[PDB]
């Protein structure tokens, strides 16, 4: 199961880890992708997860969009986890660098409540432009199911733990 995580709350855990390496080791039921509405997995966590699947995540995602159209900011869809997990929950947090409303971050984290346990990144963090400290606060105050947060950057991980209320 998940190992080496620091316990933040009754249901939220955190670790300084590369989510691709973590997913390959644990093979969780659900890995969360930091998706955009088009499921174009070019960079950030999405680019990394898609590269680990040898682009199979992108081929599946393009068929999903061709059939269903784009997701909503704050929405999600469940697709295959390929070689990383049973399922991938593609969640769209607001991208501050595209001028999207940070208030949609709580709606994005509500998608996690449909799954009993998840391996996830902090939504809207990294190249999505939000404050990761804020994202962790919204995560703890919204998600009720068991969430294992992987934070790639060691310096950010230390800042998140040391400033956690
Ligand atoms: C190095 N690993 C181990 C297993 O083999 C593969 C295969 C594909 C990708 C990676 N990891 C990766 O790209 N990680 C990555 C990058 N940028 C990122 N930005 N934000 C998160 C985040 C994660 C790995």
Short mmCIF file of C-alpha atoms and ligand atoms in Angstrom, two decimals:
data_model
loop_
_atom_site.label_atom_id
_atom_site.label_comp_id
_atom_site.label_asym_id
_atom_site.label_seq_id
_atom_site.Cartn_x
_atom_site.Cartn_y
_atom_site.Cartn_z
CA UNK A 1 0.00 0.00 0.00
CA UNK A 2 1.05 3.71 0.32
CA UNK A 3 4.24 4.17 2.34
CA UNK A 4 6.29 7.02 3.74
CA UNK A 5 3.45 9.56 3.82
CA UNK A 6 3.10 12.22 6.50
CA UNK A 7 -0.39 12.30 7.99
CA UNK A 8 -1.95 15.80 7.82
CA UNK A 9 -5.56 15.00 8.86
CA UNK A 10 -7.84 11.99 9.45
CA UNK A 11 -7.97 11.44 5.63
CA UNK A 12 -5.20 13.56 3.95
CA UNK A 13 -1.58 12.31 3.61
CA UNK A 14 1.42 13.90 1.83
CA UNK A 15 4.80 12.80 0.43
CA UNK A 16 7.64 14.41 -1.57
CA UNK A 17 7.43 12.17 -4.61
CA UNK A 18 7.19 12.04 -8.36
CA UNK A 19 3.56 10.95 -8.95
CA UNK A 20 4.65 8.83 -11.97
CA UNK A 21 7.17 6.87 -9.85
CA UNK A 22 4.62 6.61 -7.05
CA UNK A 23 1.91 5.33 -9.41
CA UNK A 24 4.29 2.73 -10.95
CA UNK A 25 5.16 1.43 -7.48
CA UNK A 26 1.75 1.41 -5.81
CA UNK A 27 -0.51 0.67 -8.88
CA UNK A 28 -3.35 2.54 -7.02
CA UNK A 29 -7.03 2.06 -7.89
CA UNK A 30 -7.16 5.76 -8.87
CA UNK A 31 -4.48 8.22 -9.95
CA UNK A 32 -5.62 11.81 -10.41
CA UNK A 33 -4.43 13.75 -13.45
CA UNK A 34 -4.16 17.56 -13.42
CA UNK A 35 -6.11 17.78 -16.66
CA UNK A 36 -7.34 20.61 -18.85
CA UNK A 37 -10.81 20.72 -20.50
CA UNK A 38 -9.46 19.37 -23.81
CA UNK A 39 -7.53 16.51 -22.17
CA UNK A 40 -4.39 17.74 -24.01
CA UNK A 41 -1.68 16.29 -21.79
CA UNK A 42 1.28 18.43 -22.87
CA UNK A 43 3.13 19.36 -19.72
CA UNK A 44 3.07 19.40 -15.94
CA UNK A 45 1.65 16.36 -14.21
CA UNK A 46 -0.51 15.53 -17.29
CA UNK A 47 2.48 15.57 -19.67
CA UNK A 48 4.41 13.38 -17.25
CA UNK A 49 1.61 10.79 -16.71
CA UNK A 50 0.87 10.66 -20.45
CA UNK A 51 4.61 10.12 -21.27
CA UNK A 52 4.70 7.23 -18.75
CA UNK A 53 1.84 5.57 -20.70
CA UNK A 54 3.76 5.88 -24.02
CA UNK A 55 1.01 8.30 -25.23
CA UNK A 56 -1.80 5.72 -24.72
CA UNK A 57 -3.47 8.19 -22.29
CA UNK A 58 -3.54 10.86 -25.05
CA UNK A 59 -4.94 8.45 -27.70
CA UNK A 60 -7.73 7.38 -25.31
CA UNK A 61 -8.35 11.02 -24.31
CA UNK A 62 -8.69 12.20 -27.92
CA UNK A 63 -11.36 9.51 -28.57
CA UNK A 64 -13.18 10.61 -25.35
CA UNK A 65 -13.21 14.29 -26.48
CA UNK A 66 -14.28 13.38 -30.02
CA UNK A 67 -17.32 11.60 -28.53
CA UNK A 68 -18.19 13.84 -25.57
CA UNK A 69 -16.72 17.28 -26.11
CA UNK A 70 -14.62 19.14 -23.56
CA UNK A 71 -14.93 18.87 -19.79
CA UNK A 72 -16.00 21.82 -17.63
CA UNK A 73 -13.43 23.67 -15.42
CA UNK A 74 -14.12 22.04 -12.01
CA UNK A 75 -15.24 18.79 -13.69
CA UNK A 76 -13.79 15.37 -14.25
CA UNK A 77 -13.99 12.12 -16.11
CA UNK A 78 -12.83 8.58 -15.34
CA UNK A 79 -10.67 6.90 -17.96
CA UNK A 80 -8.16 4.02 -17.91
CA UNK A 81 -5.11 4.22 -15.64
CA UNK A 82 -3.09 2.26 -18.29
CA UNK A 83 0.20 1.01 -16.74
CA UNK A 84 -0.08 3.43 -13.79
CA UNK A 85 -3.31 2.58 -11.98
CA UNK A 86 -6.68 0.85 -12.52
CA UNK A 87 -8.29 4.23 -13.36
CA UNK A 88 -7.24 7.79 -14.01
CA UNK A 89 -9.52 10.47 -12.68
CA UNK A 90 -8.90 13.48 -14.97
CA UNK A 91 -9.77 16.56 -12.92
CA UNK A 92 -9.77 20.12 -14.22
CA UNK A 93 -8.74 22.64 -11.65
CA UNK A 94 -8.87 26.33 -12.63
CA UNK A 95 -5.75 27.57 -14.47
CA UNK A 96 -4.87 31.00 -13.03
CA UNK A 97 -2.40 31.50 -15.95
CA UNK A 98 -5.43 31.31 -18.34
CA UNK A 99 -7.45 33.71 -16.07
CA UNK A 100 -9.84 31.03 -14.71
CA UNK A 101 -11.73 31.59 -11.46
CA UNK A 102 -9.81 30.22 -8.43
CA UNK A 103 -13.22 29.75 -6.74
CA UNK A 104 -13.72 26.62 -8.93
CA UNK A 105 -10.94 24.83 -7.02
CA UNK A 106 -13.40 23.55 -4.38
CA UNK A 107 -15.69 22.13 -7.13
CA UNK A 108 -12.65 20.41 -8.67
CA UNK A 109 -11.69 18.73 -5.35
CA UNK A 110 -15.32 17.55 -4.84
CA UNK A 111 -14.72 15.05 -7.67
CA UNK A 112 -12.33 13.18 -5.34
CA UNK A 113 -15.26 12.32 -3.01
CA UNK A 114 -16.58 9.83 -5.57
CA UNK A 115 -13.54 7.53 -4.92
CA UNK A 116 -12.63 5.90 -1.59
CA UNK A 117 -8.87 6.32 -2.04
CA UNK A 118 -6.76 8.31 -4.51
CA UNK A 119 -3.16 9.12 -5.41
CA UNK A 120 -3.22 12.79 -6.44
CA UNK A 121 -1.30 15.98 -7.11
CA UNK A 122 -2.36 19.36 -5.62
CA UNK A 123 -4.94 20.76 -8.01
CA UNK A 124 -4.25 24.05 -9.77
CA UNK A 125 -0.63 24.04 -8.47
CA UNK A 126 2.52 23.98 -10.67
CA UNK A 127 1.95 25.37 -14.12
CA UNK A 128 -1.77 25.98 -13.31
CA UNK A 129 -0.61 29.05 -11.34
CA UNK A 130 -2.44 28.79 -8.02
CA UNK A 131 -0.82 29.04 -4.58
CA UNK A 132 -0.10 25.41 -3.51
CA UNK A 133 -0.64 26.34 0.17
CA UNK A 134 -4.19 27.43 -0.78
CA UNK A 135 -4.70 24.25 -2.81
CA UNK A 136 -3.75 22.05 0.16
CA UNK A 137 -6.15 24.04 2.42
CA UNK A 138 -9.04 23.55 -0.04
CA UNK A 139 -8.13 19.84 -0.39
CA UNK A 140 -8.24 19.23 3.41
CA UNK A 141 -11.48 21.22 3.78
CA UNK A 142 -13.26 19.51 0.82
CA UNK A 143 -12.09 15.96 0.33
CA UNK A 144 -13.57 13.43 2.79
CA UNK A 145 -12.18 10.27 1.14
CA UNK A 146 -8.57 9.05 1.59
CA UNK A 147 -6.19 11.18 -0.44
CA UNK A 148 -2.44 10.57 -0.87
CA UNK A 149 -0.80 13.74 -2.16
CA UNK A 150 2.43 13.54 -4.13
CA UNK A 151 4.41 16.81 -4.24
CA UNK A 152 7.25 16.71 -6.79
CA UNK A 153 9.29 19.68 -5.50
CA UNK A 154 11.14 19.00 -2.19
CA UNK A 155 11.34 22.69 -1.32
CA UNK A 156 7.60 23.13 -1.84
CA UNK A 157 6.86 19.93 0.14
CA UNK A 158 8.83 21.28 3.13
CA UNK A 159 7.03 24.64 2.92
CA UNK A 160 3.59 22.91 2.70
CA UNK A 161 4.27 20.73 5.78
CA UNK A 162 5.85 23.48 7.86
CA UNK A 163 3.04 25.98 7.18
CA UNK A 164 0.11 23.51 7.51
CA UNK A 165 -2.48 24.61 10.02
C1 LIG B 1 10.96 9.59 -13.75
N1 LIG B 1 9.74 8.78 -13.88
C2 LIG B 1 9.90 7.44 -13.29
C3 LIG B 1 9.20 6.38 -14.11
O1 LIG B 1 9.42 6.55 -15.52
C4 LIG B 1 8.97 7.77 -15.95
C5 LIG B 1 8.29 7.82 -17.16
C6 LIG B 1 7.70 9.01 -17.55
C7 LIG B 1 7.75 10.13 -16.74
C8 LIG B 1 8.43 10.09 -15.51
N2 LIG B 1 8.26 11.12 -14.56
C9 LIG B 1 7.91 12.43 -14.81
O2 LIG B 1 7.97 12.95 -15.92
N3 LIG B 1 7.60 13.11 -13.65
C10 LIG B 1 7.11 14.42 -13.52
C11 LIG B 1 7.53 15.46 -14.37
N4 LIG B 1 7.08 16.72 -14.36
C12 LIG B 1 6.18 16.96 -13.40
N5 LIG B 1 5.62 18.15 -13.11
N6 LIG B 1 4.77 18.05 -12.04
C13 LIG B 1 4.81 16.79 -11.66
C14 LIG B 1 5.68 16.03 -12.48
C15 LIG B 1 6.13 14.72 -12.56
C16 LIG B 1 9.06 8.90 -15.14
#
